[PDB]
Design a binder for this molecule. Sequence first.
Ligand SMILES: Cc1ccc(-c2noc(C)c2Cn2ncc(N3CC4(CCCCO4)C3)cc2=O)nn1
Ligand SMILES: Cc1ccc(-c2noc(C)c2Cn2ncc(N3CC4(CCCCO4)C3)cc2=O)nn1
Ligand SMILES: Cc1ccc(-c2noc(C)c2Cn2ncc(N3CC4(CCCCO4)C3)cc2=O)nn1
Ligand SMILES: Cc1ccc(-c2noc(C)c2Cn2ncc(N3CC4(CCCCO4)C3)cc2=O)nn1
Ligand SMILES: Cc1ccc(-c2noc(C)c2Cn2ncc(N3CC4(CCCCO4)C3)cc2=O)nn1
Ligand SMILES: *[C@@H]1O[C@H](CO)[C@@H](O)[C@H](O)[C@H]1NC(C)=O
Ligand SMILES: *[C@@H]1O[C@H](CO)[C@@H](O)[C@H](O)[C@H]1NC(C)=O
Ligand SMILES: *[C@@H]1O[C@H](CO)[C@@H](O)[C@H](O)[C@H]1NC(C)=O
Ligand SMILES: *[C@@H]1O[C@H](CO)[C@@H](O)[C@H](O)[C@H]1NC(C)=O
Ligand SMILES: *[C@@H]1O[C@H](CO)[C@@H](O)[C@H](O)[C@H]1NC(C)=O
Lengths: 336, 336, 336, 336, 336
Amino acid sequence: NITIFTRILDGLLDGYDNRLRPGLGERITQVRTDMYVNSFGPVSDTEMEYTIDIFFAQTWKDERLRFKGPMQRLPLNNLLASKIWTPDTFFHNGKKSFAHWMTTPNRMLRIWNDGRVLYTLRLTISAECPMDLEDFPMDEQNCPLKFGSYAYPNSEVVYVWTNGSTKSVVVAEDGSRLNQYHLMGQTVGTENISTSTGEYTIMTAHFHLKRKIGYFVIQTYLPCIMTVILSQVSFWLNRESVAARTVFGVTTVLTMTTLSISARNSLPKVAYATAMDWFIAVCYAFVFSALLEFAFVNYITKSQPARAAKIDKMSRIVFPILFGTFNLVYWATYLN
Amino acid sequence: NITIFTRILDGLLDGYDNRLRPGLGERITQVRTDMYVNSFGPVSDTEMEYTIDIFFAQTWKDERLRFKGPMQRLPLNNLLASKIWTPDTFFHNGKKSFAHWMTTPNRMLRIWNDGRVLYTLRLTISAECPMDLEDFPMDEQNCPLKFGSYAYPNSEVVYVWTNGSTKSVVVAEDGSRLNQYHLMGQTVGTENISTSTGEYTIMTAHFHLKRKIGYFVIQTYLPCIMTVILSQVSFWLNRESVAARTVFGVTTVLTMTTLSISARNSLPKVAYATAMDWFIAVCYAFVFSALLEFAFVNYITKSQPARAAKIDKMSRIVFPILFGTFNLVYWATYLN
Amino acid sequence: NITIFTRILDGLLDGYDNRLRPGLGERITQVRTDMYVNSFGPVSDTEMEYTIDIFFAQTWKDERLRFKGPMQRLPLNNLLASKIWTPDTFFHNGKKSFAHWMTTPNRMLRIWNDGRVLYTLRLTISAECPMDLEDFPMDEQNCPLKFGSYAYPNSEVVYVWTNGSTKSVVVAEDGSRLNQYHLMGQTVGTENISTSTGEYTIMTAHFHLKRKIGYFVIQTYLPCIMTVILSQVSFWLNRESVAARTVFGVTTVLTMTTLSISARNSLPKVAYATAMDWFIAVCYAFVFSALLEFAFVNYITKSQPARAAKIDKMSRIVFPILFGTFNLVYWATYLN
Amino acid sequence: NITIFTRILDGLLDGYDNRLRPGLGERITQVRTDMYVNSFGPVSDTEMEYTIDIFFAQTWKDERLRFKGPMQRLPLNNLLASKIWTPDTFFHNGKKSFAHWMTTPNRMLRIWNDGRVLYTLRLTISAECPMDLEDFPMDEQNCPLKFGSYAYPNSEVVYVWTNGSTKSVVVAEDGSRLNQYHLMGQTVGTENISTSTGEYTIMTAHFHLKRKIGYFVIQTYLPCIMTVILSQVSFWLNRESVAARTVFGVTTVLTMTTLSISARNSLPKVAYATAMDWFIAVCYAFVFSALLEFAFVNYITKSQPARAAKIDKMSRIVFPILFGTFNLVYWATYLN
Amino acid sequence: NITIFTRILDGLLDGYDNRLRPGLGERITQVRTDMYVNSFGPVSDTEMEYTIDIFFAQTWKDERLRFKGPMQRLPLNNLLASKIWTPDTFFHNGKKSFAHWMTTPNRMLRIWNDGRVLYTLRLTISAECPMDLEDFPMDEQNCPLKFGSYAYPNSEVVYVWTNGSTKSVVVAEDGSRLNQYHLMGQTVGTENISTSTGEYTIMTAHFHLKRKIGYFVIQTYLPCIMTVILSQVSFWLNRESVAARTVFGVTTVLTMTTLSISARNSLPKVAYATAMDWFIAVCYAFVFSALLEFAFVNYITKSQPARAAKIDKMSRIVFPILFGTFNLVYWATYLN
Ligand SMILES: Cc1ccc(-c2noc(C)c2Cn2ncc(N3CC4(CCCCO4)C3)cc2=O)nn1
Ligand SMILES: Cc1ccc(-c2noc(C)c2Cn2ncc(N3CC4(CCCCO4)C3)cc2=O)nn1
Ligand SMILES: Cc1ccc(-c2noc(C)c2Cn2ncc(N3CC4(CCCCO4)C3)cc2=O)nn1
Ligand SMILES: Cc1ccc(-c2noc(C)c2Cn2ncc(N3CC4(CCCCO4)C3)cc2=O)nn1
Ligand SMILES: Cc1ccc(-c2noc(C)c2Cn2ncc(N3CC4(CCCCO4)C3)cc2=O)nn1
Ligand SMILES: *[C@@H]1O[C@H](CO)[C@@H](O)[C@H](O)[C@H]1NC(C)=O
Ligand SMILES: *[C@@H]1O[C@H](CO)[C@@H](O)[C@H](O)[C@H]1NC(C)=O
Ligand SMILES: *[C@@H]1O[C@H](CO)[C@@H](O)[C@H](O)[C@H]1NC(C)=O
Ligand SMILES: *[C@@H]1O[C@H](CO)[C@@H](O)[C@H](O)[C@H]1NC(C)=O
Ligand SMILES: *[C@@H]1O[C@H](CO)[C@@H](O)[C@H](O)[C@H]1NC(C)=O
């Protein structure tokens, strides 16, 4: 009974040329692609790359595979995949990709009577996602994914999505979990590119990422805020206690400096100012400014003490007000 | 004499199609799976992955392999494994897996007269274990492991455990050793999933992990506790010694800040508060609060010394009591 | 209809020796090469290596592949690439190179009636780029790329660029993006090398890199500048406040020392002075010099206070002027 | 003349089944194993793994390979290794192993007239060595190495060492060099294991490692010892110099804290106390205790100075004696 | 015309046994080896390994390959390399080696009428170079490289260099560039080794490395020298300024301690004293000694001020002289 299928499989391979695409010199082959994202890999800001695992599926029509039998479908494995012609799809922006072989090469091959062929593949892609870290950490990123033919121009093989955008790409609820990003949604598109060899069709999918804040607040913002408050305490002290107020000014300035170095260790070495950098500079100014006020006061404490006392008392309320006002502008500007 | 076995092996391969599962178009194939964990690999909290080494064994029934001879069993090696049909089992959550080839590919193939087939394989799996580090370090994790068919729907191939749960999965006494976790036990389960291609059966195994405390106590908790005690010593000093008490307040505050940065270097960059973070914040408040008390006292030491002395003496007993009370609540809450 | 192409392909392979180059013992084979750089990889100063991804294309003429048919071109895939003779091109300076295999080996093979053959390949090259970091960070680098034949001397196979330099090598607008470099332009050249085995032709392409400044300014220059300003404040203080001015001198000197160690952590361990190193040394001298001035003043404050006051007041204006003058010379010299 | 050997080699392969072990269904095969360690790889305490390079050799007897000719031995290469039956030996505790292929696969195959077969292989093994770091750094480790059959039970294939223990395993004089360990000696043993599939024979080799001290003395012990001495100097100072003695106490306590964090960075994250940890805690107590003594003295310096002076002078001799006494007990206990 | 070569190639392969060395059972095969080093890889002191890239060439004589034709030479590629017998050369000390495959496996095969065969190969070798870091950083290293046969004893295959030593090994002018080493020269040698399997010939090449100083001077020596000078300034201060001189002593001692920890982070964890370590210890003594002098002076400043002043003034000139004298001895001893 099983032998009936064996004859059908043998017959199809007879007189079959895997080096020739279906409908060669007759028409234009059409391929339908669908994707399912099992998990979104970590995003490496330093290397401008992001990993992703998907189940890429390609469908096309081949008349040479027509057959008749009791079953309309022939589930199979990767053994027969290399015995026929399959598209040479590749990812243009994929720096490094690898497949999964254990326990068995994760591939499927299904054939219908009319000639429809289904070929699903599991892949891990490490693509490149350029970013503009000008509004860091309040930044939105659009990481793309591009794939297409490598040797068949648009006049021979054309890639088109199947059904609507929602069904075209699917992301698992638990897979879309990142430590410092949110996956708002996905979009798809198509475009043509002109190259030296000819014209080719390109399928593009974009992912929208919204960075989540809260890790940097505990890491960088809060230490800066508390350090500024620490310096202001020196004003409430007495002028004659030169040594006491000296410690406050010196220690606070050095504390801000080390935070600036430590903060950018994880951040990519971008050669331009970021929003976080300006916040540190403003905080550095307040602590540095407080030290200057003490030095100026101590320089004139012997000639005109009347004005010196006013400056010492005035700075108590002036500095906190300015620091509070700056924070409202800073957070509001980047959160709106 | 040995030639008798050679003929039997040759006969089975004759007229055998490795591309067709046993009982195709006749019934539903049944597969029994058992696992043995030789060693549980390190758990990477940063990457949310854990490594594991296992001896995966699959058993099924094939009528085409029936044979008769003096021996009821035919021990073999990986050479004959690729000459017949084997299931395309894969791990759904396996990011990266590799096999062992030295000295020889670690695989076995045994055949019985009735047609029973045994196929054991050795694998190293690097799966993903999402975690909710809200009660860190007093947290319990449930790392799963999923595997199933890739091309055969539930209507063709079904996976079921053999015997009870205890025999289904076994973990070595010495293998289940981790630097920062305890392996309390294991559990198994089964479920069905509906996908675009059809319905498939999924076999799931869960591991219960209980993080062991003691490394963080020496690393983070104790330095914070001692630092708080250090600040309280400043109260016993005299008010006029402004410079002396200034050093205590300034140094202690900076000491807590550096610990907060260092502590989270190893921890994953989670964008939410943890139990350990609150403990540091409370400790930071005490040291910061002590500095404020000294500044307030020194500001009124010239007008109303009577109340200033009471505050200085009152803070000696008040602060230790509150700090001790907080610890009992903190540890009791997360240890019950 | 499709069978016509099948016969043509079979005919060419008949009586074809892939071990013999076209025109063996008759003339000298000529090969034309073109390159397209999709993305320029990160430059590792520590390892003196840079990664690059390209689409290498080679063209040559073979009379044995002449054919006649309705189509003048025969698009194909990597399947037929190994059935014929292809050049053994290799990169002389390539420490480690790998190809891309997913989804399919990214290769193309096209044949014309006259015998022209096109063979494009996708590669990732990790070459070596020696650098002279004497004017760091104001330095320009010239990273080369060399390739040629490995077994065919110049008398047999010759490599020559096609068309002008602009068409020979192309770099993508978005691909040429680096965190700490600018890609000004590219150049090409040819040369001959004499070796033990004979004479060979070498094709060389040079890339001009202009390091972008701005990351080191925030990282190293600014902390040094502010630290110097901090020390100068000690002059405005009073001499009798020995402890107060002592803190300024001690803290500033240590601050510069740690920056020197931290700054060179990322930089390669070059055993010679750099421009940045001299800047730190000059800044270290000012802070160290200020401490010496205070010690000298305090040593003679009991014998001849008249001259001590003049030095204290004189240093207020003298030091800032010298520091400002030095910066203009330093920046102008390396920016012109 | 050479053709005589060619016929012999062809004859043996004729009618040879590589899937059947020698003496199948007749007797029990016996295998002799010998090892030579060229170099002992670094021991990773963090990952509890150690690398090793060996020349594994296996010998067995096969009657089917009997031959007659002028030469009693037939040196060969890896080409003929896969044409016959070889044992499926594997390492039970080997997490990851790889072979050497350049210039040629490092394997040998020799055959004698009686049927004796020699098969040597070169391997690199990354095994796991669990450790009990309770007496760290004065700890002794016993890293094992296990190998055996994967599919042939004890009733078919048995592994036994050849000759005495000394000849069984050999370690190169220069290979046994480690940065933080000493290789005292080696031992061998045999045991049987009962599993689900049956009974198997296991060959075990143990290596005795004696950690060498001297790196931690310069790294951790000495800084702690000097820091304790630094605090004692504060006693010789005068009580009225509150600020001076305050600096000694504050700085010393923080210095010990940072050493504790830095010291354990390299050490594995073991969740239990070690001998080194207790030493730091004792040193921390002395420096912390000294600060308490000063605070207590300064609190009563106004009421009863008579007793305050005695405590200040008494602590000068008391503290050094206790610290010296503790060291003798600590070192003697762990060095005996 | 080309067909003439095809027949010659086919004829040689006919009746050719790749499993038998030329002149088997007749004489002893002789092999000539030459090497060319394109680039010397980085030397990893921590792992005691060094990478190297070479073009290894082997030559031998085979009578079975004699042929007659118009051309005396037959350039070829790697395709025919595996069709004949080649030596199983391997590197004894090579921990891990890999070849280059892109664009084509970098191998050559040339044959002459007399039977001379040339076989060149490109390899990357990561060998092991044990070092004795007793005079670090003024140390000279001799990194060897060993290769030989794996299965052919000395009685069958013998390796000998060709021509003089200079032609035997060649190093590129630009390739021999290291960040912290100088390649003075190279040497070659031969030796025999007796093993269990028999006697084998070993070819050895030694490289002489001279570490370049200048990176450690900026990194470790200079900070130590300046720190010592800083402590001496405290002597010029007045005794009554107890707090001022206290800061100098405390800060300097801690500064030296951190440098010792940081300095050895890059250095391998060698368990013995190095020359650099002694320099730090001597520098630590001076700064520590200065603090003791101040404490002793302050202890007797009330009883016998006459002697206290002499010590304070005496130490001003005594300490600089001793420090300068020590440097001359230290540098002269290790630089001669
Ligand atoms: C389709 C195809 C395949 C191979 C080749 C090719 N093969 O040898 C050479 C030389 C080329 C030139 N070449 N390569 C690539 C290329 N891409 C890269 C591109 C821009 C960046 C995003 C992705 O899309 C357009 C354009 C081009 O002109 N040309 N087009
Ligand atoms: C069984 C199977 C095999 C292949 C495919 C398939 N092959 O090409 C496409 C496109 C798909 C779509 N697809 N892929 C995967 C999938 N899994 C992943 C899942 C959720 C997360 C945990 C593991 O289980 C359910 C559902 C689905 O619908 N579909 N089901
Ligand atoms: C073309 C070729 C191919 C193989 C060989 C060869 N094969 O076995 C040996 C031994 C050699 C010697 N050898 N190797 C290499 C070589 N290059 C490297 C070089 C200098 C640095 C930049 C790149 O170009 C010149 C010169 C030389 O003389 N000789 N030339
Ligand atoms: C010999 C062999 C080979 C394969 C298998 C096997 N193959 O599929 C399953 C399932 C098993 C079960 N299994 N696996 C391994 C095993 N070892 C591991 C062990 C303990 C730790 C040290 C090393 O030795 C004993 C026992 C056992 O019962 N059983 N024994
Ligand atoms: C030539 C060869 C090849 C294989 C074998 C061999 N194959 O199975 C076993 C077991 C051995 C034993 N063995 N292995 C190696 C060996 N070397 C390593 C050595 C010392 C260190 C520097 C490099 O040279 C001498 C000596 C020895 O006795 N014996 N010699
Ligand atoms: C790409 O080419 C096809 C040819 O049929 C055309 O229909 C389509 O509009 C083109 N796409 C773009 C974006 O120009
Ligand atoms: C899965 O499908 C099988 C079909 O026989 C059914 O028996 C089983 O109950 C299903 N499992 C679940 C969880 O629905
Ligand atoms: C290389 O050799 C060719 C031989 O035709 C010659 O034409 C060319 O000028 C040579 N190039 C150089 C740089 O000498
Ligand atoms: C293992 O089994 C063999 C069977 O012959 C027996 O001789 C040997 O004593 C057994 N070893 C142990 C440790 O029980
Ligand atoms: C090695 O053996 C050969 C045998 O001919 C001998 O000539 C040579 O001197 C030996 N080398 C050494 C170092 O003993």
